[PDB]
Curated annotation (Swiss-Prot), chain C:
Residues 87-181 form the WSC domain. One of its GO terms (molecular function) is transmembrane signaling receptor activity. Keywords: Cell membrane, Disease variant, Disulfide bond, Ectodermal dysplasia, Glycoprotein, Kringle, Membrane, Signal, Transmembrane, Transmembrane helix, Wnt signaling pathway. This is Kremen protein 1. One of its GO terms (cellular component) is membrane. It is linked to Ectodermal dysplasia 13, hair/tooth type: A form of ectodermal dysplasia, a disorder due to abnormal development of two or more ectodermal structures. ECTD13 is an autosomal recessive form characterized by severe oligodontia accompanied by anomalies of hair and skin. Residues 2-85 form the Kringle domain. The chain holds residues 30 to 322 of 473 of the full protein. It comes from Homo sapiens (Human).
Length: 45, 249, 293, 192, 292, 249, 249
């Protein structure tokens, strides 16, 4: 029985940390290329 | 499922042909876009001089030598006095634009070397100074180093990017290598990155454009000594608001 | 210099105090029968023990200790901070606070680290100083400012070396620094006074060492050769004081040839020779020369 | 994200030269090009990596690593390298014959200039402590050694010494745990 | 009702990537090992395609490496001494709000270029001897433009509009929630530009990198006193960054900082990696080999 | 509803026949199993050399005397230099396996005595020392006592198991008695117990194998004096991962 | 409908990358298979240590010179003292396995030469002797020539394969050329060929592995003189039966 993530103030920024939206999108840093290269393929053919 | 080595980049009346290209880095997977109505704050209608400013401007050619440290440009500053882009950048207070940075360095199959072409957002240039009082001039970089113009600026300490950050982690930025055995060009398409929808093209430089030789240019006697490095950049989706008298700096 | 060993198991120096200032007195050895080390279990000498409260190291610990009155929470012994017990090559115990390190140079973590394995690691790279830390870390450098974080008590560097638990190898944030000349397989000594050691001195000298130390004080008349430590108990392994220009033997020392208190020579150019058999390696020697102009 | 491993972290080597693994034409066979430990948080080549610096903000790490070696020689420079990952328990292999008993890749220089050596998550524990040294060599990851499988062959009038750039990163199964404070920059006074 | 929301409030475990079982591959054209690092893309090579892997149903939690968990930790952002003894009988101090004065918080923030966040500021105040006698303090936030106090009695302490916290030293640390206060969409730890137009030809060039979008005013602290108290109070400000939005990751700082508002490293550049004896020397002894 | 006195244990090419057996202790009611996918962490495919390593290795024979204190072995250490198990234990960093420990001690119906054959997980060997400083050598057991090898180690103080724990409570561990009037063998099937799915066969010894005479061997003149105690153990479900150069210790 | 020049061979923890490969010769169109129940005769359960023995073992590097005659290895003999394969080959009387022989020889585009990499089943080595009595030592090859080990043996008369058979017809065997202008590797996948389902890895060598320079290595001054030839072989479907004491030869 969990009783947390409760805001006691009318201002939304007084709430606790937003710790329920873990999203991992590494492609914008790891594969930031136009031509999607398959793993099994030689990249520069 | 592979990247074709041939590529043609047609923007405006400019066209760039490359036959040894690695790929095209789309910075952070985001194409340059015009400022949406939701993200805009300025009320004036922006000018979008599509083909007069969005085009490839070949700006600088730097001779790669064996002991060369590297060069860096600041994207708005490197075009602020060139073409119709510069005029719009001077006549308008506000500006936003992506770019298609295309670095060119061709060498024979008997040359070797590797450049690191990276586009660094908010490339704050550091000064290398001894322990001194905040009064000291050496603690802060002069304007020639913060805004090198179109000529660029030779790196003093490319190992720390002249920013106190290790060059080895500069690959966290949108980057591409020019490995002379592999490719002769590096293309980076960078969208407008800023905490603001528009910003002054004169005061604020959104991105740094570093070209650092990681593997030094080595060749044998008889090979062509002069191995140039050319920077051709093209604004993409350039907007300008706040028309007034043209301001240089 | 009162101690010529790394652990202080040579100290007979009349200090009945854990520290020269702000410490605890030592319990007499002829009265500490509640404990393993006393004059009853060690009748005749046997570690400098006797009828005295002087700090000693009979158990082969990292530093000379002594029994203290057990009152605090059962602490019945304490290491003695003897400032004169520093090995002639031991530059001191210094603090290590962070990433600008005391010895800027190369590092090495070894689960077999000794004082010599660190010195030998640094000497092989032409480094002047060798710094052991945390019992397993070895740091090298030519930095003349290894004291950039201040000196520390010798007892703060009393962590056992992972390869020899009888030697101090620093501690958490504490680095014990040695001059990399210690235990060298030869070398040139042009100085007034220096304590030349056996090859790989804090450890036992290796099997097969043929080492030559050049001691030429350019302008001295006599060289006072003293041996504060000659644990060379063997037959083939011998220490010879070869001459200089002539390269003639002046004094040969081995097991049953223990040296006099001062084998003075009138030559301003002496060659300290060392030999080691293929077996029966001992603790080594520690010669000390003093040039008189 | 792959970042340059500082494999040439040797005395005398300064600046960007510390990021290059020198490869040259060998007069003998089965020789060692370079070696480095694959402990991400250990003082060494992995400090120059984003993974090796974010690891230091955490106490325990887990998952496979990845070192992409890029050959930066002439197009005419050919060569084959054996890049071996030696799991824990063994020191650095003294011969290529001893190194090829571990996880290795035989890299052939060619049109594709880069090879990836995955350091597989070969561990007894689910996590390895980022701290190394002492009893924490229990969490040793291993050693990656680069061997000359064949020579570095070049035609005449071609540079005989090239560079390999190592690019270390983390695999998709990488995981960090127990956020802590890094020991990379120290401060003795408030920055004014 | 809304009891379903209170039920799904505990942090759920997001696990790492499972490893699939892989077999041997003997053929041509399939080269998952060969990459092209010039493309600027990290290697897409998987462990299954380079070695024979097993099936590992990975249950390691990746949830702690989030930007929220990495940043939602109160670190020291300011030490404000309320000097009221000796030559400085002020009893008040106006502190420029800057989170880049201490290395641990500064280096974590500079991992990102832009950060938009709310903060939980905590004030841990005490005397020099660590004691906390009941002594009324006033922590007034003076936003940019609000008049700064020039004494312990000045009118600005009336705080009719300024946020102010009255708390004795004996009380638990005052803690308040600060919103994202910035004219920009996000704070900017790196501003490659100048705040004003002009020539920027000064010998010092102090204005490079100074973005006023980050300058969020001052924290004016005073002892609520009528005369000198003879006691200096050390107020340590701790900022916990919550509701974090980070953009444009950057290399973590490698050189030691020298100043607060400028990247400025010494001429003695420290290598990111510690030096070793040779490129072929590793200090891992391992075990005794069976047959050398 | 009873335990048959005859038993045959067939593992690999090894078969053990006993005609006076009490029962077979299945340690903690858990058969040895291969590491499931849910509990595994190492990604390499383990080697399961089923019949080459999972087999009975008769390792040591100790002569039970009237004044004998007992013997203990460490299960991985006792097989680390024997057969194909030892080779896999040396060539591989990771190892996990159960075992079927079979202690054999036969004596005439005119002999008497009782052995306590117990398998102790994580049998940390203690040292018996006077009150001494932590510098003292006697405070910690030498490697010959922690890893006795295949020969085993004679107990110094079997009353405290050389571990500070009373021998009388060693029956909390998977145990079996060899009561010479009742049985001549003790079989214990122990699954892999460890806080880790795999572990180093060289560094870590998962179980201790104690054989302590509780009732001393007494007989009359004319009986066979030499009454041996033989340790035959068999790995069960042996996996090995992390192939590398063979490491001895 | 063509052979791709790039190839990756992943067996065990070993992976072999080649970018200039001709093809992969599947010897006699038969992949290596485990011994079927119909063809087996030994009743013991064979051990199939899949990933510990079936993996690429880089065994020998021979320097190709202008006057080099060639080299030959015997497949079981070349691995009988290497890795877990050697241990299984010594501990077990019976053995059967295919292999994936991968010969590597890279040279610049300015080098020339052609190797003949052939896998010869039952490569009985001949001796070259004058007309002599059967008592003469020269009539029969010494053991160093019949079982050269891992180092291989330099051909004495490559024209007759040191077997009395013409080298020109050695192409009847599963072969591949390393033509330096075309490819730098030769891969031959050979199934277990023998008149017996299993055989002794120590006594019997199933295949010979010849690497003979047909076109001699010629280059100009300035080219890299040392042009090595590396033999990486990988057992495929290795079975071992008849466990006993490890036998070296
Ligand atoms: C009653 C007391 C309330 C405290 C008010 C605190 C307000 C803090 C402002 C928010 C902190 C984040 C912005 C800091 C940016 C400055 C750093 C810089 O760029 O130099
Ligand atoms: C004061 C009452 C608050 C009730 C909050 C809801 C708690 C629901 C209990 C079940 C916990 C959620 C996870 C689960 O389904 O097991
Ligand atoms: C130490 O010994 C000296 C010997 O002369 C004595 O004078 C002194 O009182 C002793 N000190 C203590 C604390 O026992
Ligand atoms: C120990 O020796 C000292 C020095 O002679 C003496 O004063 C003391 O009484 C002795 N103590 C005992 C218990 O013998």
């Amino acid at each position: 029985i969990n009783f947390t993530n409760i805001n006691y103030y009318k201002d939304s920024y007084a709430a606790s940390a937003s710790r329920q939206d873990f999203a991992q999108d590494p492609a914008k840093f790891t594969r930031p290329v136009l031509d999607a290269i398959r793993e099994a393929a030689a990249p520069l053919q | 499922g592979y990247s074709d080595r041939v590529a043609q980049l047609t923007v405006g009346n400019s066209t760039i042909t490359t036959q040894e290209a690695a790929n095209i880095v789309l910075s952070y997977g985001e194409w340059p876009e015009y400022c949406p109505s939701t993200d805009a704050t300025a009320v004036d209608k922006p000018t979008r001089p599509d083909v007069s400013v969005n085009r490839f401007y070949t700006l600088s050619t730097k001779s790669w030598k064996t002991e060369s440290t590297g060069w860096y440009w600041k994207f708005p500053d490197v075009l602020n006095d060139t073409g119709v882009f510069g005029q719009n950048a001077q006549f308008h207070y506000l500006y936003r634009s992506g770019f298609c940075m295309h670095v060119q360095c061709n060498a024979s199959k008997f040359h070797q070397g590797a450049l690191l072409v990276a586009a660094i957002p908010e490339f704050v240039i550091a000064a290398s100074s001894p322990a001194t009082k905040p009064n000291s001039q050496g603690l802060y970089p002069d304007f020639a180093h913060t805004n090198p113009g179109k000529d660029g600026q030779e790196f003093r300490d490319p190992y720390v990017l002249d920013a106190g950050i290790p060059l080895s982690q500069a690959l966290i930025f949108p980057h591409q290598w020019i490995n002379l055995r592999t490719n002769n060009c590096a293309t980076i398409i960078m969208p407008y990155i800023n905490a603001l929808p528009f910003d002054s093209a004169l005061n604020h430089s959104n991105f740094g454009l570093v070209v650092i030789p990681i593997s030094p240019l080595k060749y044998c006697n008889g090979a062509t000594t002069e191995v140039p490095i050319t920077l051709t950049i093209a604004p993409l989706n350039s907007e300008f608001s706040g028309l007034r008298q043209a301001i240089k700096q | 210099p009162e101690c010529f060993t790394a652990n202080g198991a040579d100290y007979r120096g009349t200090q009945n105090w854990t520290a020269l200032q702000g410490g605890k007195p030592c319990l007499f050895w002829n009265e500490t029968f509640q404990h393993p080390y006393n004059t009853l279990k060690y009748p005749n000498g046997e570690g400098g023990l006797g009828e005295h409260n002087y700090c000693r190291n009979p158990d082969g610990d990292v530093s000379p200790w002594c029994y203290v009155a057990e009152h605090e929470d059962g602490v019945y012994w304490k290491y003695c901070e003897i400032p004169a017990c520093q090995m002639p090559g031991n530059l001191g115990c210094y603090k290590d606070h962070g990433n600008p390190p005391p010895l800027t140079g190369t590092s090495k973590t070894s689960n077999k680290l000794t004082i010599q394995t660190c010195i030998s690691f640094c000497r092989s790279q032409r480094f002047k100083f060798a710094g052991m830390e945390s019992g397993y870390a070895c740091f090298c450098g030519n930095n003349p400012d290894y004291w950039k974080y201040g000196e520390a008590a010798s007892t703060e560097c009393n962590s056992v070396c992972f390869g020899d638990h009888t030697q101090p190898c620093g501690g958490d944030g504490r680095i014990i620094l040695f001059d990399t000349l210690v235990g060298a397989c030869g070398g040139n000594y042009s100085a007034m006074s220096s304590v030349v050691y056996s090859p790989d001195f804090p450890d036992t000298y290796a099997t097969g060492r043929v080492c030559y130390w050049t001691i030429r004080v350019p302008g001295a008349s006599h060289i006072h050769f003293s041996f504060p430590l000659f644990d060379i108990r063997d037959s083939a392994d011998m220490v010879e004081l070869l001459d200089g220009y002539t390269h003639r033997v002046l004094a040969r020392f081995h097991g049953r040839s223990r040296p006099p208190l001062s084998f003075n020579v009138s030559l301003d150019f002496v060659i300290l020779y060392f030999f080691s058999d293929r077996i029966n390696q001992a603790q080594g020697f520690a010669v000390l020369y003093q040039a008189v102009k | 994200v792959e970042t340059i491993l500082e494999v040439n972290n040797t005395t005398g080597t300064t600046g960007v030269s510390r990021l290059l693994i020198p490869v040259r034409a060998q007069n003998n066979v089965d020789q060692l090009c370079a070696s480095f430990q694959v402990d991400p948080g250990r003082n060494g080549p992995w400090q120059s990596t984003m993974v090796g610096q974010i690891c230091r903000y955490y106490t325990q790490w887990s998952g496979s690593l990845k070192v992409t070696f890029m050959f930066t020689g002439s197009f005419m420079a050919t060569g084959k390298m054996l890049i071996a990952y030696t799991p824990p328990g063994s020191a650095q292999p003294t011969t290529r014959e001893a190194a090829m008993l571990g996880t290795h890749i035989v890299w052939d220089f060619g049109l594709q200039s880069s090879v990836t050596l995955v350091i597989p998550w070969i561990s007894n524990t689910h996590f390895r402590a980022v701290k190394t040294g002492g009893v924490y060599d229990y969490y040793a990851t291993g050693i990656v050694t680069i061997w000359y499988q064949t020579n570095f062959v070049v035609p005449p009038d071609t540079p005989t010494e090239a560079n390999i750039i190592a690019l270390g990163a983390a695999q998709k199964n990488f995981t960090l745990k127990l956020c802590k404070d890094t020991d990379e920059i120290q401060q003795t006074a408030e920055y004014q | 009702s809304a009891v379903s929301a209170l039920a799904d409030t505990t942090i759920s475990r997001v696990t790492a990537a499972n490893t699939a079982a892989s077999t041997h591959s003997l053929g041509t054209g399939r080269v998952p090992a060969l990459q092209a690092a010039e493309t600027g893309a990290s290697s897409n090579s998987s462990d299954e395609n380079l070695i024979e892997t097993r099936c590992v149903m990975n249950r390691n939690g990746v949830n702690e490496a989030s930007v929220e968990h990495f940043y939602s930790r109160a670190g020291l952002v300011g030490v404000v001494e309320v000097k009221d003894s000796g030559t400085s009988l002020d009893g008040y101090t106006v502190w420029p709000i800057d989170v880049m004065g201490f290395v641990q918080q500064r280096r974590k923030l500079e991992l990102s270029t832009y950060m938009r966040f709310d903060a939980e500021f905590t004030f841990v105040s005490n005397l020099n001897n660590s004691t906390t006698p009941g002594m009324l303090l006033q922590y007034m936030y003076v936003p940019p433009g609000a008049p700064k106090p020039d004494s312990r009695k000045s009118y600005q302490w009336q705080t009719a509009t300024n946020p102010s916290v009255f708390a004795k030293l004996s009380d638990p640390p005052p803690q308040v929630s600060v919103p994202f206060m910035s004219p920009a969409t996000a704070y900017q730890w790196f501003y490659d530009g100048y705040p004003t137009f002009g020539e920027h030809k000064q010998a010092t060039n102090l204005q490079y990198g100074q973005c006023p979008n980050n300058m969020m005013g001052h924290f004016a602290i005073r002892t609520v006193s009528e005369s000198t108290t003879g006691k200096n109070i050390h107020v340590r400000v701790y900022m916990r960054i919550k509701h974090v939005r980070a953009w444009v990751p950057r290399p973590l700082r490698s050189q030691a900082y020298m100043v607060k508002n400028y990247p400025t490293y010494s001429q003695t550049i420290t290598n990111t990696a510690t030096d070793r004896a040779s490129i072929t020397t590793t200090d891992y002894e391992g075990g005794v080999p069976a047959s050398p």
